[PDB]
């Protein structure tokens, strides 16, 4: 029963690895190697640039030195000490080229990218100080960057929406915050995989402070935000809330973070989910903030995730000369970028979905952080959250069954799941909510428990008739899924062994009730039905609960 | 007791360190990561390119996809597969650049210089198959450079166009040739036989022949990269235990239009006061302002053109062509080069006469190559450089004087075993028309027999002190820098050191020679495999010493 001992065992040298993703490391859409994109740019405003060894002299291509640099403290470090140095070096880098406010910083883009290749290369070495640098560091960046993230709500008259149509450096400033964002989502990984044992380090008032600073200029209640920036803002604090609970000696640090700190996170955060989605204009200027659009003018995917169409990642395939070694860059063009494929449109907000899926959930995870609990949840965690419940009922009702589209069973699931945060909300943290918020919303919450409930009996197929003939209707695409999954994707589910598709005749079809406001499952139907009928509250007349049931029975 | 574990063995890749010294790759003063300096090679009339994926267009820099390669190569290929991948990719770049007489080809040096990086990296590792390929690659791109195939000897006038561009990478790819042979010898003493292939060995003829030219003016560092390689296949000769073969594969032929320009180059003159002088040709090795630098192993001294190197890729500017490389904007201080360029040559005709004494070895028995015409002139050699140092190269306090006696040691070596045992290639033609030179060398070294010169402890240390200045100086380095226990010696350390540094500059002085080197030249005359001297010439010479 020997397990062999391999006497010549080819174990790789993961920093090399490393070293390699980084040399050939390749934003979606460039013509080479981003790195190399560094590799053929000189700057005329840093003459000779040092941290350790990394002289971008005034002949130097970033990349010239960057490399370089790889090459050096690759002979220099181990794996941990070379994510460290990368980090430092790299980022005293973004700063002087970045606070230099006349050079050419579109090194810095692809520098925070190479941040993020770093960290999220090895999150499993990489170490809390250098995380902390990296974040504050882009962090005062973005600050750096105030003119793009908070550029007014429509231009009011005197300001002009004139810009000279540049994703150019567009793209430089959003490119480094949404790159720098996912770069805080990996720092927190880091230390959200770390031990938690070793929590009282990488959480101080200084991250608190710089992300406050950079989260309130990207959720820009009061001027135009960007969705990318949006979306990596609200990543962050989904991640934080994340580990918000999974720190272990949680009382202290949730100390530290202030309270009204949580709440201007969730005031904006509010703000969002009660911010829209208008597809057929996603992709031009549209309404004040209501309508969350990451405007082709603005539109890349991200680094843990694609959203947009990254048609500006194919001008990132003219980012650079590629042919010279450009002081200034390629432009990218924000009137360039972007009756084609809609499905852009769709796979963006199929996004946006699990975006509100995110903050639902963080909110929820908010409602766990406490249990007994404060400003941030006084009742308007069922105010907000219930509210976009209903909105979301309602408009999946009134449009979005019959719109039909991929969209249906994503956005039901989660929004069943945001009645279940309702629910465990008004029983556990039934402590807090008081008269005056319950009267604020007694509407919202009793009647979206009611709609919820109009359904158990389903008398009208309980079975796989024509609740399948539903399944094709909405479920369609739920229907190219089952297709799929089982001729493309599943090395099992093809000739299935009898016992599976018994099931799914059912399964599928209270998928698709879900998708059509019926038939959720037991689980969800009396979850609904006891946020309502827990008289221990009279949030129904007694009187009146008869009336109220009588639209199903009881 | 027991020999310990470790939980957490971290050994990096033999790839991994692979692409460290790739990728860091250097040449002295190409002051760069020479991946990067292949970066900064963009070539516009080949906007197509294509041979294991290697896309090149116009702005795009061969070192782009020299880096395209190198990385994802490191995941695709493994240690030896990845070394051939390199040599036939970056192979058919040497090609279709040096087969492409319109672009210039500052490719071509630095895709050798990684070609070495990889042929160094390991011997072991490094495959004779891959080795073999990149040799006969070298040989298509001098083929497809024929018009730049040598350096025929005035429309020079510093100017370096192609000499900064062809001439340049022809000195790289002659070091590449070199190193190549040398890896292959460092190749175990049991696999060469498939590197010996007639191909192989015929296309080295013609680049010897093209190196060693003796009707055009033969770059140095070229001349040197060739005997490198001569000795190199001599050296891989002694070692294929089954030598019949690779003797058989070498052809008399071969044997003989090598030795026969091998004679030619022994017999250049060294000459340090005017080494980097292109005067008087086909003897002094010139190697002057027109071309001087290392190549790929060569420290030929000041690596003057070293940092030209550098400065041949622009480092601050994307360039189709190459940044000049200035040939006499070079240096110049003192002739400590032109002293270490003398040790260099004398350790270069060190090699020709240590290839010599060791097929005089191996071809001990009857040799169509151990002919005497060898005794003619390898003993020409020796009585010549005897006279040289014994008349000129006393008093000269060089570090090269050790060198000239190292030639003449081993040139007695040479013509002793030849003397001792194989004459049956000799007749009474060679034996007159060379007695005076092996005789001399016999006398030379008796008349040392005396053992009167020193004798002592008063002298020998003042005539260091007279022209060994310069070795003792450097016995002075070591007894300084060197080596270790030089502190609160045994008593017998420092004593060893002065009796050696005696008579190490007698040795100098062709006197007080090593007493086996006295009685290996004694017994040629006295031992009477050929009595030289009749009874009316023997004591003609015994009367010179006493006897």
């Not at 504050?136 to 149509?165: A, G, T, W």
């Not at 208008?278 to 004040?288: H, L, Q």
């Not at 929004?415 to 465990?424: A, D, G, K, P, V």
């Amino acid at each position: 029963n020997m397990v062999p001992l391999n006497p010549n065992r080819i174990i790789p040298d993961e920093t090399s690895l490393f070293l390699e993703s980084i040399l050939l490391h390749q934003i979606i859409g460039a013509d080479l190697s981003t790195i190399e994109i560094l590799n053929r740019l000189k700057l005329d405003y840093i003459t000779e640039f040092k941290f350790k060894n990394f002289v971008i002299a005034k002949g130097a291509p970033i990349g010239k030195s960057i490399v370089s640099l790889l090459l050096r403290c690759k002979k220099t470090l181990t794996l941990d000490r070379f994510i460290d140095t990368l980090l430092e070096d790299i980022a005293v880098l973004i700063k002087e080229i970045s606070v230099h406010p006349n050079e050419s910083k579109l090194a810095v883009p692809f520098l925070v990218a190479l941040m993020y290749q770093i960290v999220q290369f090895r999150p499993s070495a990489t170490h809390n100080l250098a995380l902390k640098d990296c974040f504050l560091f882009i962090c005062d960046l973005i600050r750096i960057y105030h003119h793009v993230l908070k550029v007014p709500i429509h231009e009011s008259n005197m300001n002009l929406h004139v810009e000279p149509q540049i994703f150019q450096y567009e793209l430089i400033d959003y490119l480094i915050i949404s790159y720098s964002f996912d770069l805080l989502e990996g720092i927190l990984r880091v230390l959200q995989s770390h031990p938690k044992q070793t929590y009282m380090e990488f959480f101080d008032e200084n991250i608190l402070k710089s992300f406050e600073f950079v989260y309130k200029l990207a959720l820009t209640i009061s001027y135009k935000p960007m969705v990318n920036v949006i979306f990596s803002a609200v990543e962050v604090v989904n991640i934080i809330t994340s580990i918000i609970l999974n720190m272990d000696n949680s009382s202290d640090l949730k100390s530290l973070i202030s309270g009204s700190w949580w709440r201007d996170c969730i005031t904006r955060l509010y703000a969002l989910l009660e911010k829209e989605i208008k597809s057929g204009d996603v992709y031009n200027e549209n309404v004040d903030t209501t309508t969350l659009h990451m405007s082709k003018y603005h539109d890349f995917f991200g680094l843990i995730r694609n959203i947009g169409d990254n048609e500006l990642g194919g001008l990132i395939s003219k980012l650079i000369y590629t042919d010279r070694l450009q002081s200034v860059p390629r432009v990218i063009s924000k009137e360039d970028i972007g009756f084609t494929a809609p499905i852009i449109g769709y796979k963006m907000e199929k996004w946006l979905l699990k975006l509100k899926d995110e903050v639902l959930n963080i909110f929820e995870n908010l409602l766990m952080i406490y249990g007994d609990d404060a400003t941030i949840v006084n009742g308007e965690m069922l105010i907000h959250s219930s509210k976009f419940l209903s909105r979301e009922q309602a408009l999946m009702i009134e449009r979005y069954v019959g719109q039909d589209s991929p969209n249906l069973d994503l956005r039901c699931h989660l929004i069943e799941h945001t009645l279940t945060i309702i629910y465990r909300l008004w029983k556990d943290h039934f402590k807090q909510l008081r008269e005056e918020q319950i009267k604020q919303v007694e509407s919202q919450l009793i009647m979206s428990l009611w709609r919820f409930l109009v359904c158990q009996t389903e008398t009208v197929t309980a079975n796989e008739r024509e609740m399948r003939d539903h399944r094709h209707l909405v479920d369609s695409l739920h229907d190219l899924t089952i297709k799929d999954q089982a001729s493309y994707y599943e090395d099992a589910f093809e000739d299935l062994p009898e016992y599976i598709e018994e099931e799914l005749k059912m399964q599928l079809n209270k998928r698709t009730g879900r998708i059509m406001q019926v038939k959720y499952d037991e689980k969800f139907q009396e979850m609904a039905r006891t946020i309502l009928e827990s008289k221990s509250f009279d949030l129904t007349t007694l009187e009146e609960a008869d009336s109220l049931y009588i639209s199903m029975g009881l």
